[PDB]
């Protein structure tokens, strides 16, 4: 009994600005759909961003390179804005080398297999002398949200050589998005709503693919509502008792007192186990000695004891 919004009359203003239109909508669904889509698109849109770089002679971010006009920190901030589109890969290494006089942009990046630079006029540094060259390797990864360089530690699982410059990653192509509603031109119906969404991105992702991805994300999130329904650990412990190399006289005693696990023997205060028949003062000291050898002094206090 409801009309389904069809994606019609999608138009592109510039390489970044774009307008999409959903013509058939009911009375109140326009604002709901627009706000939900805007939140989904701004929050989590998969994209690609620079993860780290390696310059030839540069050792850290706060250093300088002879011949270049900008600090290495400035180079990192410039490279943070580089927007690329990759196909079938997630760790693309964009080696660039150039020498001469003037700015160095994304156009001189070596032409990789399947990597598209949205704009080739995005300068990243300058060369101010003829006999100086710049040579760097950029790693571009695919991600979802804003991941600061400092907060990631998994990259340190393998030691990074001194010279790897970790940059922050945004991964979000959608920079700005706005939505508006108007009266549909349909005259046979009494009144209908039409939604127009304007998106300003960095050119990485198509507006139609963006809308489809946001709608799929919303649908999978809503799928959880469609069917509501719903209406003693230390390795030293838990060890066989016949591993402390005890005397024969204690083996019969320990079996008689139902002590088969090492940890249970630990939980007994010195005073209490004396009443055990034929324990032996010297034999008890041997029990304390071997337990002291493992570092488990008698008198501890555990909480739970599983049968295993």
């Amino acid at each position: 009994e409801f009309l389904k919004p069809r994606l019609v009359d999608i138009e592109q203003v510039s390489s970044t600005h774009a307008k999409v239109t959903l013509e058939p909508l009911e009375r109140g669904f326009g604002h709901t759909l627009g706000n939900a889509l805007r939140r989904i698109l701004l929050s989590s849109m998969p994209g690609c961003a620079v993860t780290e770089v390696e310059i030839d002679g540069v050792l850290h971010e706060y250093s300088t390179k002879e011949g270049v006009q900008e600090d290495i920190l400035e180079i990192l901030l410039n490279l943070k804005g580089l927007a690329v589109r990759v196909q079938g890969k997630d760790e693309v290494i964009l080696t660039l080398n150039k020498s001469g006089i003037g700015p160095v942009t994304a156009a001189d990046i070596t032409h990789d297999g399947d990597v598209e630079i949205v704009k080739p006029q995005h300068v990243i540094c300058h060369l101010t002398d003829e006999n100086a060259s710049i040579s760097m390797r950029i790693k571009v990864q695919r991600g979802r949200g804003y991941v600061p360089a400092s907060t990631r530690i998994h990259s340190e699982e393998d030691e990074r050589p001194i010279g790897r410059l970790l940059v922050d990653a945004c991964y979000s192509p959608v920079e700005r998005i706005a939505y508006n509603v108007e009266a549909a031109r349909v005259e046979q119906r009494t009144d209908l709503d039409k939604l127009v969404i304007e998106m300003e991105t960095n050119g990485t992702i198509d507006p139609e693919e963006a809308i489809r991805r946001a709608a799929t994300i919303l649908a999978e999130q809503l799928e959880a509502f469609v069917d509501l329904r719903d209406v003693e650990f230390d390795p030293i412990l838990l060890r066989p008792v016949d591993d402390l190399e005890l005397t024969v006289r204690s083996a019969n005693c320990l079996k008689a007192e139902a002590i088969h696990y090492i940890g249970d023997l630990v939980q007994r205060t010195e005073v209490e186990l004396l009443k055990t028949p034929n324990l032996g003062k010297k034999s008890l000291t041997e029990i304390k000695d071997v337990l002291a050898s493992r570092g488990l002094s008698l008198g501890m206090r555990l909480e739970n004891w599983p049968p295993a």
């Binding site: 050792l59 850290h60 971010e61 706060y62 250093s63 030691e159 001194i162 010279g163």
Partner: protein
């Protein structure tokens, strides 16, 4: 005697010596955190009575047998970051540092 600065430091594993050059200073740009070792300084201790225990200690280990104590600049806890510059200063007459 002299408090001497070296990369080699007794009773410290190879993990903490990865960021020290052959003179005992951090590589420029190395990212230090926590209590990482900055410069390896060893302060000689006193002993003129080589007891048999000390004799066999020097036999099984190096000639010093870790007699020299370490007083090495470690980054104070809660301080992290990249090393920017090192400004080694030397006394005239003594051998100049490699760095």
């Amino acid at each position: 005697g002299p408090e001497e600065i070296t990369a080699d430091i007794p009773n410290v594993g190879e993990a903490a010596l990865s960021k020290l050059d052959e003179s005992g200073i951090v590589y420029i740009g190395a990212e230090v955190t926590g209590g990482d070792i900055l410069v390896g300084k060893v302060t000689p201790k006193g002993e003129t009575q080589l007891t048999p225990e000390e004799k066999l200690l020097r036999a099984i280990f190096g000639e010093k047998a870790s007699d020299v104590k370490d007083s090495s600049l470690r980054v104070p806890n809660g301080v992290s970051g990249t090393v920017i510059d090192v400004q080694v200063f030397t006394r005239d007459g003594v051998e100049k540092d490699k760095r």
